[model samples]
Target: YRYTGKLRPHYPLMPTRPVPSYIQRPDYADHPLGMSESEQALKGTSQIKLLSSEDIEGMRLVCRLAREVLDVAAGMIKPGVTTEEIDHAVHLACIARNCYPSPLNYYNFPKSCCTSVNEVICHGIPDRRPLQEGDIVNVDITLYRNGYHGDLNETFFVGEVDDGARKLVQTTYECLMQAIDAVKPGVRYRELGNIIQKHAQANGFSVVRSYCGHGIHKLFHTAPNVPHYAKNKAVGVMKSGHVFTIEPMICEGGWQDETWPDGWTAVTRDGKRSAQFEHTLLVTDTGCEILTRRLDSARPHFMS
Candidate 1:
């Protein structure tokens, strides 16, 4: 049962992508079959990892790679392009750089990266479905290189979208920028969601309630669950050396979401279009650093 203009699952999920034998992987790549004790311990900690100079430098390299791979995938957005092609190209890009595509097999995820379509809040698996002319898709990229992780994602207009989707996409990016601007030493981590939620609600959009950003560095996800709503009870204070993400997922309808039986894909309960923007950030002496920023030439025109 598909609602009018409401998004629905495409069905029959594909097999999880396989990592090449040569590239090194994160400890969690082994999954239920096995995992390192250190990896398991990191998952249980709520304290933030204050990155050292060496750790920050390693993150810079990985973050830059994630940006480049995302650019490659973004360049392919258009009507009739299957998300599978984007996933394949992104996988090869990771292999060519000798880094692991961070999402593959991590917590049993089937794709190298997440390609979320309209109404899919996030974690929309890459499938054979070709992006339609009016669709909006968000391509999330994370690269694990030299033992650190870098994360980011962007929403793109598939071809020609209606005004509603266009506005939602534009506002979602604004939410991210506002949230980032609110980052600095001594700032409460919970304040981020306030900024994002205010902007989204004012624009007639809703902040997704299910998923939030996290502390991402050596691990794919770590401490500090960064909620994307106002008045969240999340704990933490921004301190120098703290690095994390402020990815806000906004929906055109109800913020509540439901997941498919696949256990990975998440879609809006009301089936309205959704948009998201992300950047792994580092809290600095005065403010934050956008480690995955695309230059003026590469950023979307609407960002201008």
Candidate 2:
């Protein structure tokens, strides 16, 4: 059944190009975008510093638990499932492990996880919207466990997808992984953005600059805003004990973005689709450790 209220129109900033087969148009036919607004003041504004050896151990455990939750949530993706259902699964997964869903009630976000459907760049609140064939959706999950937080997300194809959309998703994933590989002691935090932006441009895409990666630890968002595009003047050096996420939101067209009327869902300024993949990492004495490593069962290809 379709929703019943007046649907919110797509953001004007999004490109007006043909909708890719892998991009699912939101079923916003019913409620207005204002329904998703929140009046609560934002909390957890403090920055988390890089960790010590003992702190890294705690972060490792948090990352593992967050990865397990994400893997289980990803398995629940399929046609005919609602984003709310996915949110429920995520909430349960976190709670089952005695952790808190980091997004829940954070600044009054209603859902436990962010279900960013096609065109919804990020901070998509889970609702009655159901997944459809060819739709590409991103599940952003963060968990607070053991006094630390683990943050990560990945965009997934719902079913059969088109080439353009597939390329966007695939390139986004590769860019993030490549950026992660560049992490080493004494590297400048700003350099990560250059590597990611170069990779995206080489693939004929743009990197979203509005949202960057951040430090995750005792608090959710902290210092060292890690931009994925190149030539940023970001502060801090990636030391041996630094921990942060390197998520780059890649756009099919321009990198500009605008928020929906809902006040949370960010979309490509040209209506083009966006894809992202993220991982929480700990900079090591030598290189880094991918605390949220995917399991054997979670090995899916870029186009899968």
Candidate 3:
């Protein structure tokens, strides 16, 4: 209510859904808040987790699956569709492809994936509210399969939207693409933020300072916290085989955020609209490849 936007989360969340015992899972799936290999990976001192050829191929598969899952979810965004329904679609989509929904139990995050509506910048837990027309929401989908993880997300317009909302989402997409284009061997990871912040600020938007992009592969989160602002201190050089995500969270007002009591959803302090776009990327010998690029056939409904 303090944020001035009507977009507060609907309360009384349902319990986390259970993944069948037969499916592959990260170490945290059963423990919620306990020790797991993925949790321990957070303390790892490595500069980055370089993916092997097999790891890279597995990443590609999982990222491709993520895109498909997002497309299915995107097609469902409209007036009257509940966020829980979107989560159900994502859960089944992953199972149909034999992939684990990465966010299912990672560090006690509930739900199968993230559905960040309106002011919620990230880590949104799915709920029962039917999305209303003119609302913008971001459905973040990540999947773990065959021993690797691929992370990607995009903000969507529920039905009709204002000009400012459309520009923010579309420009956030541009920020992600441009940052991915800047990836290559010998490039500094800090440059990613530098590139993102410049565009974000030039467009009269604020870049979220609390969260940043991270090194993601087998582990859910890793080193190289990428700040999305100019003149940041993020260090490291992009080497071949380094895999990560460049997700920029752009806000229509102040960049500061407040977390919901659920400890998952984050919304803008000013209650203005926010948008984000992300892609799992791999730095090749010369350039980079977007592992989660949308297929021509599965073109996003948000754009149309």
Candidate 4:
């Protein structure tokens, strides 16, 4: 198989790690083909689940757990660490907390968490590539526990990066925050793309259109499909109790993507750099809450 960017898929991906028998597992966890039947059934319906207070509390617990796991993975970022090592850390962290690493075997994903480096957009399966100086990597983490799932991701600088990479990383974070700030009751899910797209273009970057955020709960991916590029026909309106994610994959070149031969890894079509940020959110009576908000133990990286 061939690749378009400087990055290459490492051979001999580690064997699938095991989750403790007692850890609650998602339905797809044991499927030979990693089929998520629940998600497949939801495809024919557009109904968005309005989580109840109890379910919201479940989200609170799971999202916080996800954040902590992300912090553990983020703390390992450096010039020479392999992404596979990040995956190992994330897997161990999730099981230690008695949470299922949501990505494992979901649609046959081989890794515990996604590590997108450089031109890779999202779902870049963890590999043996050592993160080089001046590279940026995004660690996407999700945890499942007590029948709820928490999902979030953030990009980090590997050592020091150039000004162009810095701008892309910073602007991607801003796009997520600004779009998140606009979340409120009665807002259209489609409007988020406009906010993200406008900001990305203004900063000389482009918004990736192929992948957008989605409604996440018990199911890893579901309703209220969110597009990060403008002029999308994404349906649904935000209301109290509505839970979803707004992850924008911003690229330094044209907003096009190509998946690697691995069938899971996605990269910029132009082979330029890309960065992303994600948060699981809930709409309240007047506004929204960042369910995956970083804890005091985790100082925001690259926000300085």
* Whole-model lDDT per candidate: 0.86, 0.76, 0.84, 0.91
lDDT of 2 by residue, 1-304 (tens): 2211222333222121222233221122112431212111223333337687778888888788888888887888889898878888887787777777777656546567898877767887777767878878899998876667889898998887788889999889889888888899989899999999899999999988889898877667777688888899887788877889998899888888887666677877677788889899888878999888786645533444
How many clashes (backbone N, Cα, C below 3 Å) per candidate? 0, 10, 0, 0
Model 3, 1-304: lDDT tens digits are 3544676667677766767777787777778473467547468464777778988888889999999999889988889999998999899999888888988877777789899888888988888899988899999998988777788898999889999999899778878777888999998888888889888888998899889888888777787677777788787888899888889999998999988777778989778889998888889988998889888654445677
**Model 2 TM:** 0.83
Cα error, residue 215 of model 3, in Å, equals 1.2
Top candidate (lDDT): 4
Give the lDDT of residue 113 in candidate 3: 88
Clashing pairs in 2: 5-30, 13-269, 14-269, 14-270, 14-271, 15-270, 15-271, 193-228, 193-229, 194-230
Every model: Cα RMSD to truth = 2.1, 9.6, 1.7, 1.2
- Which candidate should be chosen as best, given TM-score against the real structure? 4
- Candidate 4 TM-score, true structure as reference: 0.98
Clashing pairs in 1: none
Question: Candidate 4, residues 95-196: lDDT per residue as tens digits?
Answer: 999999999988889989999999999999898889999999999999999888999999999988999999999899999989999999999999999999
Question: Where is model 3 poorest over a 10-residue stretch in terms of lDDT?
Answer: 32-41
Task: State TM-scores per candidate.
Answer: 0.93, 0.83, 0.95, 0.98
- Higher-scoring candidate on lDDT, 1 or 3: 1
Could you tell me which residue pairs clash in candidate 4? Answer: none
Worst 10 residues of 4 by lDDT: 295-304
Ranking by TM-score: 4, 3, 1, 2
Better of 1 and 2 by lDDT: 1
lDDT of 2 at 106: 64
Task: Evaluate residue 252 in candidate 1 and report its C-alpha lDDT on the 0 to 100 scale.
Answer: 93
